[PDB]
Amino acid sequence: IRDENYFTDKYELTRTHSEVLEAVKVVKPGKTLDLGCGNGRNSLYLAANGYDVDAWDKNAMSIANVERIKSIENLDNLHTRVVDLNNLTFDGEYDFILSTVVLMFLEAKTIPGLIANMQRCTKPGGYNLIVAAMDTADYPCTVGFPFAFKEGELRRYYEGWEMVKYNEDVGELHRTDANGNRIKLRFATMLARKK
């Protein structure tokens, strides 16, 4: 059974993102863009559960790995591209576009146009899922991500969409090791539906 441990265990990948697992409880299978699929964990999970997925990332090796796994699992509905997100414009119509812990790694000048692109390429009634680090007065960014959302910023980006889920909750960077310190910081987490 293709659940959130299947690809994780079989192919040594980071576990399917929690927010994606939550999101498939409301977003029905449909045409999907995984913008910055990383190692493909989310793209694989989704393609294996009925979604028609376009998986894009800048890392050619990860994309080759995803292609390899695609062939073994016979996932005919998973299509990959190698792409530079800081230099990207795209056309299309998707029911679902996700971007989980990707944006903070992009140049700040990239964000406004990338988000605008995500939005015009979403079908009415479609969804966008975004998870990204923040930089706020009570938790200034201590990591030095080239980009981080300010308070209310992501919300405002999506004025006119329905906020199905939205929070700027305090999270943490943690390690599974004994002497591993935990860094608190805010993350912006949004499931938005387009009107």
JSON list of C-alpha atoms in Angstrom, two decimals:
[
{"chain": "A", "resi": 1, "resn": "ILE", "atom": "CA", "xyz": [0.00, 0.00, 0.00]},
{"chain": "A", "resi": 2, "resn": "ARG", "atom": "CA", "xyz": [1.32, 3.42, -1.08]},
{"chain": "A", "resi": 3, "resn": "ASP", "atom": "CA", "xyz": [1.03, 5.42, 2.16]},
{"chain": "A", "resi": 4, "resn": "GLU", "atom": "CA", "xyz": [3.35, 7.96, 3.82]},
{"chain": "A", "resi": 5, "resn": "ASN", "atom": "CA", "xyz": [5.86, 5.26, 4.81]},
{"chain": "A", "resi": 6, "resn": "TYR", "atom": "CA", "xyz": [6.00, 3.32, 1.52]},
{"chain": "A", "resi": 7, "resn": "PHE", "atom": "CA", "xyz": [8.41, 5.46, -0.51]},
{"chain": "A", "resi": 8, "resn": "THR", "atom": "CA", "xyz": [9.99, 6.79, 2.69]},
{"chain": "A", "resi": 9, "resn": "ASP", "atom": "CA", "xyz": [11.17, 3.30, 3.73]},
{"chain": "A", "resi": 10, "resn": "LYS", "atom": "CA", "xyz": [11.63, 1.68, 0.30]},
{"chain": "A", "resi": 11, "resn": "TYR", "atom": "CA", "xyz": [13.76, 4.45, -1.18]},
{"chain": "A", "resi": 12, "resn": "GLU", "atom": "CA", "xyz": [15.26, 6.16, 1.87]},
{"chain": "A", "resi": 13, "resn": "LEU", "atom": "CA", "xyz": [13.42, 9.45, 1.42]},
{"chain": "A", "resi": 14, "resn": "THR", "atom": "CA", "xyz": [12.30, 12.06, 3.92]},
{"chain": "A", "resi": 15, "resn": "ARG", "atom": "CA", "xyz": [8.74, 11.24, 5.07]},
{"chain": "A", "resi": 16, "resn": "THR", "atom": "CA", "xyz": [5.80, 12.79, 3.17]},
{"chain": "A", "resi": 17, "resn": "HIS", "atom": "CA", "xyz": [5.26, 16.33, 4.51]},
{"chain": "A", "resi": 18, "resn": "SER", "atom": "CA", "xyz": [2.60, 16.52, 7.22]},
{"chain": "A", "resi": 19, "resn": "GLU", "atom": "CA", "xyz": [0.75, 19.35, 5.47]},
{"chain": "A", "resi": 20, "resn": "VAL", "atom": "CA", "xyz": [0.47, 17.35, 2.26]},
{"chain": "A", "resi": 21, "resn": "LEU", "atom": "CA", "xyz": [-1.03, 14.47, 4.24]},
{"chain": "A", "resi": 22, "resn": "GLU", "atom": "CA", "xyz": [-3.52, 16.94, 5.70]},
{"chain": "A", "resi": 23, "resn": "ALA", "atom": "CA", "xyz": [-4.17, 18.57, 2.33]},
{"chain": "A", "resi": 24, "resn": "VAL", "atom": "CA", "xyz": [-5.29, 15.38, 0.56]},
{"chain": "A", "resi": 25, "resn": "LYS", "atom": "CA", "xyz": [-8.15, 15.24, 3.07]},
{"chain": "A", "resi": 26, "resn": "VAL", "atom": "CA", "xyz": [-9.79, 18.17, 1.25]},
{"chain": "A", "resi": 27, "resn": "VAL", "atom": "CA", "xyz": [-8.07, 18.39, -2.13]},
{"chain": "A", "resi": 28, "resn": "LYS", "atom": "CA", "xyz": [-9.39, 15.63, -4.41]},
{"chain": "A", "resi": 29, "resn": "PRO", "atom": "CA", "xyz": [-7.08, 13.93, -6.92]},
{"chain": "A", "resi": 30, "resn": "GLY", "atom": "CA", "xyz": [-6.43, 16.20, -9.89]},
{"chain": "A", "resi": 31, "resn": "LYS", "atom": "CA", "xyz": [-3.77, 17.91, -12.00]},
{"chain": "A", "resi": 32, "resn": "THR", "atom": "CA", "xyz": [-0.93, 18.88, -9.72]},
{"chain": "A", "resi": 33, "resn": "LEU", "atom": "CA", "xyz": [2.25, 20.94, -9.67]},
{"chain": "A", "resi": 34, "resn": "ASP", "atom": "CA", "xyz": [4.90, 20.14, -7.05]},
{"chain": "A", "resi": 35, "resn": "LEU", "atom": "CA", "xyz": [7.02, 23.29, -7.33]},
{"chain": "A", "resi": 36, "resn": "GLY", "atom": "CA", "xyz": [10.43, 22.32, -5.95]},
{"chain": "A", "resi": 37, "resn": "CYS", "atom": "CA", "xyz": [9.67, 18.63, -5.37]},
{"chain": "A", "resi": 38, "resn": "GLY", "atom": "CA", "xyz": [13.05, 18.14, -3.69]},
{"chain": "A", "resi": 39, "resn": "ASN", "atom": "CA", "xyz": [13.62, 14.39, -3.39]},
{"chain": "A", "resi": 40, "resn": "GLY", "atom": "CA", "xyz": [10.09, 13.70, -4.72]},
{"chain": "A", "resi": 41, "resn": "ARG", "atom": "CA", "xyz": [8.54, 12.42, -1.47]},
{"chain": "A", "resi": 42, "resn": "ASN", "atom": "CA", "xyz": [5.38, 14.47, -1.99]},
{"chain": "A", "resi": 43, "resn": "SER", "atom": "CA", "xyz": [5.29, 13.96, -5.77]},
{"chain": "A", "resi": 44, "resn": "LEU", "atom": "CA", "xyz": [5.62, 10.18, -5.37]},
{"chain": "A", "resi": 45, "resn": "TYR", "atom": "CA", "xyz": [2.99, 10.02, -2.61]},
{"chain": "A", "resi": 46, "resn": "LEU", "atom": "CA", "xyz": [0.56, 12.02, -4.75]},
{"chain": "A", "resi": 47, "resn": "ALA", "atom": "CA", "xyz": [1.15, 10.28, -8.06]},
{"chain": "A", "resi": 48, "resn": "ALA", "atom": "CA", "xyz": [0.66, 6.96, -6.25]},
{"chain": "A", "resi": 49, "resn": "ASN", "atom": "CA", "xyz": [-2.69, 8.12, -4.95]},
{"chain": "A", "resi": 50, "resn": "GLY", "atom": "CA", "xyz": [-4.34, 9.27, -8.17]},
{"chain": "A", "resi": 51, "resn": "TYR", "atom": "CA", "xyz": [-2.96, 12.78, -8.69]},
{"chain": "A", "resi": 52, "resn": "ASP", "atom": "CA", "xyz": [-1.54, 13.77, -12.08]},
{"chain": "A", "resi": 53, "resn": "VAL", "atom": "CA", "xyz": [1.76, 15.34, -10.97]},
{"chain": "A", "resi": 54, "resn": "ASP", "atom": "CA", "xyz": [4.29, 17.65, -12.57]},
{"chain": "A", "resi": 55, "resn": "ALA", "atom": "CA", "xyz": [7.39, 17.39, -10.36]},
{"chain": "A", "resi": 56, "resn": "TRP", "atom": "CA", "xyz": [9.98, 20.15, -10.81]},
{"chain": "A", "resi": 57, "resn": "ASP", "atom": "CA", "xyz": [13.29, 20.84, -9.03]},
{"chain": "A", "resi": 58, "resn": "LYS", "atom": "CA", "xyz": [16.68, 22.42, -9.74]},
{"chain": "A", "resi": 59, "resn": "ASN", "atom": "CA", "xyz": [18.65, 19.39, -8.65]},
{"chain": "A", "resi": 60, "resn": "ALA", "atom": "CA", "xyz": [19.24, 17.10, -11.66]},
{"chain": "A", "resi": 61, "resn": "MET", "atom": "CA", "xyz": [20.28, 14.14, -9.44]},
{"chain": "A", "resi": 62, "resn": "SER", "atom": "CA", "xyz": [17.05, 14.15, -7.39]},
{"chain": "A", "resi": 63, "resn": "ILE", "atom": "CA", "xyz": [15.04, 14.43, -10.62]},
{"chain": "A", "resi": 64, "resn": "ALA", "atom": "CA", "xyz": [17.00, 11.47, -12.07]},
{"chain": "A", "resi": 65, "resn": "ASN", "atom": "CA", "xyz": [16.27, 9.56, -8.83]},
{"chain": "A", "resi": 66, "resn": "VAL", "atom": "CA", "xyz": [12.60, 10.37, -9.12]},
{"chain": "A", "resi": 67, "resn": "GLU", "atom": "CA", "xyz": [12.64, 9.24, -12.77]},
{"chain": "A", "resi": 68, "resn": "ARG", "atom": "CA", "xyz": [14.33, 6.00, -11.72]},
{"chain": "A", "resi": 69, "resn": "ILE", "atom": "CA", "xyz": [11.74, 5.32, -9.02]},
{"chain": "A", "resi": 70, "resn": "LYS", "atom": "CA", "xyz": [8.99, 6.30, -11.47]},
{"chain": "A", "resi": 71, "resn": "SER", "atom": "CA", "xyz": [10.08, 3.51, -13.85]},
{"chain": "A", "resi": 72, "resn": "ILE", "atom": "CA", "xyz": [10.18, 0.87, -11.11]},
{"chain": "A", "resi": 73, "resn": "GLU", "atom": "CA", "xyz": [6.76, 1.82, -9.68]},
{"chain": "A", "resi": 74, "resn": "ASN", "atom": "CA", "xyz": [5.21, 2.31, -13.14]},
{"chain": "A", "resi": 75, "resn": "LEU", "atom": "CA", "xyz": [3.82, 5.71, -12.17]},
{"chain": "A", "resi": 76, "resn": "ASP", "atom": "CA", "xyz": [2.74, 6.85, -15.64]},
{"chain": "A", "resi": 77, "resn": "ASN", "atom": "CA", "xyz": [1.11, 9.98, -14.16]},
{"chain": "A", "resi": 78, "resn": "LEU", "atom": "CA", "xyz": [4.28, 11.53, -12.74]},
{"chain": "A", "resi": 79, "resn": "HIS", "atom": "CA", "xyz": [6.28, 13.86, -15.00]},
{"chain": "A", "resi": 80, "resn": "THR", "atom": "CA", "xyz": [9.53, 15.52, -14.03]},
{"chain": "A", "resi": 81, "resn": "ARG", "atom": "CA", "xyz": [11.44, 18.64, -15.06]},
{"chain": "A", "resi": 82, "resn": "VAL", "atom": "CA", "xyz": [14.72, 20.15, -13.95]},
{"chain": "A", "resi": 83, "resn": "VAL", "atom": "CA", "xyz": [14.18, 23.88, -13.41]},
{"chain": "A", "resi": 84, "resn": "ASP", "atom": "CA", "xyz": [15.72, 26.93, -11.75]},
{"chain": "A", "resi": 85, "resn": "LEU", "atom": "CA", "xyz": [13.00, 28.47, -9.57]},
{"chain": "A", "resi": 86, "resn": "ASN", "atom": "CA", "xyz": [14.82, 31.82, -9.42]},
{"chain": "A", "resi": 87, "resn": "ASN", "atom": "CA", "xyz": [14.59, 31.93, -13.22]},
{"chain": "A", "resi": 88, "resn": "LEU", "atom": "CA", "xyz": [11.22, 30.42, -13.98]},
{"chain": "A", "resi": 89, "resn": "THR", "atom": "CA", "xyz": [8.03, 31.35, -15.73]},
{"chain": "A", "resi": 90, "resn": "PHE", "atom": "CA", "xyz": [5.41, 28.73, -16.61]},
{"chain": "A", "resi": 91, "resn": "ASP", "atom": "CA", "xyz": [2.02, 28.25, -18.22]},
{"chain": "A", "resi": 92, "resn": "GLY", "atom": "CA", "xyz": [-0.68, 25.75, -17.34]},
{"chain": "A", "resi": 93, "resn": "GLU", "atom": "CA", "xyz": [-3.85, 25.03, -15.39]},
{"chain": "A", "resi": 94, "resn": "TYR", "atom": "CA", "xyz": [-3.60, 23.04, -12.15]},
{"chain": "A", "resi": 95, "resn": "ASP", "atom": "CA", "xyz": [-6.11, 21.92, -9.55]},
{"chain": "A", "resi": 96, "resn": "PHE", "atom": "CA", "xyz": [-3.35, 21.86, -6.98]},
{"chain": "A", "resi": 97, "resn": "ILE", "atom": "CA", "xyz": [0.04, 23.56, -6.64]},
{"chain": "A", "resi": 98, "resn": "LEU", "atom": "CA", "xyz": [2.25, 22.89, -3.62]},
{"chain": "A", "resi": 99, "resn": "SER", "atom": "CA", "xyz": [5.48, 24.37, -2.40]},
{"chain": "A", "resi": 100, "resn": "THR", "atom": "CA", "xyz": [6.62, 22.96, 0.92]},
{"chain": "A", "resi": 101, "resn": "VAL", "atom": "CA", "xyz": [9.77, 24.42, 2.54]},
{"chain": "A", "resi": 102, "resn": "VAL", "atom": "CA", "xyz": [11.07, 25.69, -0.79]},
{"chain": "A", "resi": 103, "resn": "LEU", "atom": "CA", "xyz": [10.51, 29.45, -0.98]},
{"chain": "A", "resi": 104, "resn": "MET", "atom": "CA", "xyz": [12.88, 30.38, 1.87]},
{"chain": "A", "resi": 105, "resn": "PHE", "atom": "CA", "xyz": [15.77, 29.21, -0.30]},
{"chain": "A", "resi": 106, "resn": "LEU", "atom": "CA", "xyz": [14.94, 31.54, -3.19]},
{"chain": "A", "resi": 107, "resn": "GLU", "atom": "CA", "xyz": [16.11, 35.12, -3.74]},
{"chain": "A", "resi": 108, "resn": "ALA", "atom": "CA", "xyz": [13.68, 37.64, -2.24]},
{"chain": "A", "resi": 109, "resn": "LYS", "atom": "CA", "xyz": [13.27, 39.35, -5.65]},
{"chain": "A", "resi": 110, "resn": "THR", "atom": "CA", "xyz": [11.93, 36.01, -6.99]},
{"chain": "A", "resi": 111, "resn": "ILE", "atom": "CA", "xyz": [8.93, 35.67, -4.71]},
{"chain": "A", "resi": 112, "resn": "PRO", "atom": "CA", "xyz": [6.35, 38.21, -5.97]},
{"chain": "A", "resi": 113, "resn": "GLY", "atom": "CA", "xyz": [6.45, 36.98, -9.58]},
{"chain": "A", "resi": 114, "resn": "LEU", "atom": "CA", "xyz": [6.66, 33.32, -8.62]},
{"chain": "A", "resi": 115, "resn": "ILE", "atom": "CA", "xyz": [3.59, 33.56, -6.39]},
{"chain": "A", "resi": 116, "resn": "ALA", "atom": "CA", "xyz": [1.74, 35.52, -9.12]},
{"chain": "A", "resi": 117, "resn": "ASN", "atom": "CA", "xyz": [2.59, 32.73, -11.59]},
{"chain": "A", "resi": 118, "resn": "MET", "atom": "CA", "xyz": [1.36, 30.04, -9.16]},
{"chain": "A", "resi": 119, "resn": "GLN", "atom": "CA", "xyz": [-1.91, 31.97, -8.85]},
{"chain": "A", "resi": 120, "resn": "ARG", "atom": "CA", "xyz": [-2.72, 32.53, -12.53]},
{"chain": "A", "resi": 121, "resn": "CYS", "atom": "CA", "xyz": [-1.94, 28.89, -13.24]},
{"chain": "A", "resi": 122, "resn": "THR", "atom": "CA", "xyz": [-4.43, 27.67, -10.65]},
{"chain": "A", "resi": 123, "resn": "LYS", "atom": "CA", "xyz": [-7.95, 26.77, -11.85]},
{"chain": "A", "resi": 124, "resn": "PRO", "atom": "CA", "xyz": [-10.89, 28.52, -10.19]},
{"chain": "A", "resi": 125, "resn": "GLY", "atom": "CA", "xyz": [-11.76, 26.26, -7.26]},
{"chain": "A", "resi": 126, "resn": "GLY", "atom": "CA", "xyz": [-8.12, 25.09, -7.28]},
{"chain": "A", "resi": 127, "resn": "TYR", "atom": "CA", "xyz": [-5.79, 25.08, -4.26]},
{"chain": "A", "resi": 128, "resn": "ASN", "atom": "CA", "xyz": [-2.34, 26.36, -3.36]},
{"chain": "A", "resi": 129, "resn": "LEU", "atom": "CA", "xyz": [-0.40, 24.84, -0.45]},
{"chain": "A", "resi": 130, "resn": "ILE", "atom": "CA", "xyz": [2.54, 26.81, 0.90]},
{"chain": "A", "resi": 131, "resn": "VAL", "atom": "CA", "xyz": [4.83, 26.16, 3.87]},
{"chain": "A", "resi": 132, "resn": "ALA", "atom": "CA", "xyz": [7.79, 28.51, 4.47]},
{"chain": "A", "resi": 133, "resn": "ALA", "atom": "CA", "xyz": [9.96, 30.05, 7.21]},
{"chain": "A", "resi": 134, "resn": "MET", "atom": "CA", "xyz": [9.16, 33.51, 8.62]},
{"chain": "A", "resi": 135, "resn": "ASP", "atom": "CA", "xyz": [11.02, 36.54, 9.97]},
{"chain": "A", "resi": 136, "resn": "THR", "atom": "CA", "xyz": [8.96, 38.28, 12.65]},
{"chain": "A", "resi": 137, "resn": "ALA", "atom": "CA", "xyz": [9.62, 40.75, 15.48]},
{"chain": "A", "resi": 138, "resn": "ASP", "atom": "CA", "xyz": [9.26, 38.07, 18.18]},
{"chain": "A", "resi": 139, "resn": "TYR", "atom": "CA", "xyz": [11.21, 35.48, 16.13]},
{"chain": "A", "resi": 140, "resn": "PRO", "atom": "CA", "xyz": [13.66, 37.25, 13.84]},
{"chain": "A", "resi": 141, "resn": "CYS", "atom": "CA", "xyz": [15.17, 34.89, 11.26]},
{"chain": "A", "resi": 142, "resn": "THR", "atom": "CA", "xyz": [18.34, 33.53, 12.87]},
{"chain": "A", "resi": 143, "resn": "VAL", "atom": "CA", "xyz": [19.14, 31.06, 10.07]},
{"chain": "A", "resi": 144, "resn": "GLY", "atom": "CA", "xyz": [19.85, 33.54, 7.28]},
{"chain": "A", "resi": 145, "resn": "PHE", "atom": "CA", "xyz": [17.49, 32.12, 4.65]},
{"chain": "A", "resi": 146, "resn": "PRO", "atom": "CA", "xyz": [17.76, 34.28, 1.53]},
{"chain": "A", "resi": 147, "resn": "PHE", "atom": "CA", "xyz": [13.99, 34.66, 1.93]},
{"chain": "A", "resi": 148, "resn": "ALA", "atom": "CA", "xyz": [11.41, 34.56, 4.75]},
{"chain": "A", "resi": 149, "resn": "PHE", "atom": "CA", "xyz": [7.80, 35.77, 5.08]},
{"chain": "A", "resi": 150, "resn": "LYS", "atom": "CA", "xyz": [6.89, 38.70, 7.33]},
{"chain": "A", "resi": 151, "resn": "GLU", "atom": "CA", "xyz": [3.80, 38.69, 9.54]},
{"chain": "A", "resi": 152, "resn": "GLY", "atom": "CA", "xyz": [0.61, 38.58, 7.46]},
{"chain": "A", "resi": 153, "resn": "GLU", "atom": "CA", "xyz": [2.63, 38.71, 4.24]},
{"chain": "A", "resi": 154, "resn": "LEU", "atom": "CA", "xyz": [1.57, 35.34, 2.79]},
{"chain": "A", "resi": 155, "resn": "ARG", "atom": "CA", "xyz": [-2.07, 36.00, 3.78]},
{"chain": "A", "resi": 156, "resn": "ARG", "atom": "CA", "xyz": [-1.97, 39.28, 1.85]},
{"chain": "A", "resi": 157, "resn": "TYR", "atom": "CA", "xyz": [-0.37, 37.65, -1.18]},
{"chain": "A", "resi": 158, "resn": "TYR", "atom": "CA", "xyz": [-3.54, 35.53, -1.31]},
{"chain": "A", "resi": 159, "resn": "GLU", "atom": "CA", "xyz": [-6.15, 38.26, -0.83]},
{"chain": "A", "resi": 160, "resn": "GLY", "atom": "CA", "xyz": [-9.26, 37.05, -2.68]},
{"chain": "A", "resi": 161, "resn": "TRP", "atom": "CA", "xyz": [-8.57, 33.36, -2.02]},
{"chain": "A", "resi": 162, "resn": "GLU", "atom": "CA", "xyz": [-10.33, 31.36, 0.70]},
{"chain": "A", "resi": 163, "resn": "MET", "atom": "CA", "xyz": [-8.03, 30.64, 3.64]},
{"chain": "A", "resi": 164, "resn": "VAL", "atom": "CA", "xyz": [-8.96, 27.03, 4.29]},
{"chain": "A", "resi": 165, "resn": "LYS", "atom": "CA", "xyz": [-5.97, 26.70, 6.59]},
{"chain": "A", "resi": 166, "resn": "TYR", "atom": "CA", "xyz": [-3.60, 29.51, 7.63]},
{"chain": "A", "resi": 167, "resn": "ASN", "atom": "CA", "xyz": [-1.28, 29.95, 10.53]},
{"chain": "A", "resi": 168, "resn": "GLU", "atom": "CA", "xyz": [1.99, 31.59, 11.49]},
{"chain": "A", "resi": 169, "resn": "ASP", "atom": "CA", "xyz": [2.60, 29.23, 14.40]},
{"chain": "A", "resi": 170, "resn": "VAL", "atom": "CA", "xyz": [5.90, 28.84, 16.28]},
{"chain": "A", "resi": 171, "resn": "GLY", "atom": "CA", "xyz": [7.70, 25.71, 15.10]},
{"chain": "A", "resi": 172, "resn": "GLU", "atom": "CA", "xyz": [11.22, 24.46, 15.40]},
{"chain": "A", "resi": 173, "resn": "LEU", "atom": "CA", "xyz": [14.26, 23.13, 13.67]},
{"chain": "A", "resi": 174, "resn": "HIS", "atom": "CA", "xyz": [15.16, 20.00, 15.59]},
{"chain": "A", "resi": 175, "resn": "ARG", "atom": "CA", "xyz": [17.50, 17.03, 15.50]},
{"chain": "A", "resi": 176, "resn": "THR", "atom": "CA", "xyz": [16.92, 13.39, 16.47]},
{"chain": "A", "resi": 177, "resn": "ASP", "atom": "CA", "xyz": [20.29, 13.43, 18.26]},
{"chain": "A", "resi": 178, "resn": "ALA", "atom": "CA", "xyz": [20.85, 13.53, 22.04]},
{"chain": "A", "resi": 179, "resn": "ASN", "atom": "CA", "xyz": [22.91, 16.72, 22.12]},
{"chain": "A", "resi": 180, "resn": "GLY", "atom": "CA", "xyz": [20.99, 18.51, 19.39]},
{"chain": "A", "resi": 181, "resn": "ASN", "atom": "CA", "xyz": [19.70, 22.00, 20.15]},
{"chain": "A", "resi": 182, "resn": "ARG", "atom": "CA", "xyz": [16.23, 23.12, 19.05]},
{"chain": "A", "resi": 183, "resn": "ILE", "atom": "CA", "xyz": [15.78, 26.42, 17.20]},
{"chain": "A", "resi": 184, "resn": "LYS", "atom": "CA", "xyz": [12.38, 28.05, 17.55]},
{"chain": "A", "resi": 185, "resn": "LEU", "atom": "CA", "xyz": [11.06, 30.11, 14.67]},
{"chain": "A", "resi": 186, "resn": "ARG", "atom": "CA", "xyz": [7.72, 30.87, 12.98]},
{"chain": "A", "resi": 187, "resn": "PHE", "atom": "CA", "xyz": [6.55, 29.15, 9.80]},
{"chain": "A", "resi": 188, "resn": "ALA", "atom": "CA", "xyz": [3.78, 30.37, 7.53]},
{"chain": "A", "resi": 189, "resn": "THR", "atom": "CA", "xyz": [1.50, 27.49, 6.54]},
{"chain": "A", "resi": 190, "resn": "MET", "atom": "CA", "xyz": [-1.38, 28.04, 4.13]},
{"chain": "A", "resi": 191, "resn": "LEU", "atom": "CA", "xyz": [-3.96, 25.98, 2.29]},
{"chain": "A", "resi": 192, "resn": "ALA", "atom": "CA", "xyz": [-5.73, 28.48, 0.03]},
{"chain": "A", "resi": 193, "resn": "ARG", "atom": "CA", "xyz": [-8.59, 27.87, -2.39]},
{"chain": "A", "resi": 194, "resn": "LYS", "atom": "CA", "xyz": [-9.07, 30.07, -5.46]},
{"chain": "A", "resi": 195, "resn": "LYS", "atom": "CA", "xyz": [-12.46, 31.66, -6.12]}
]
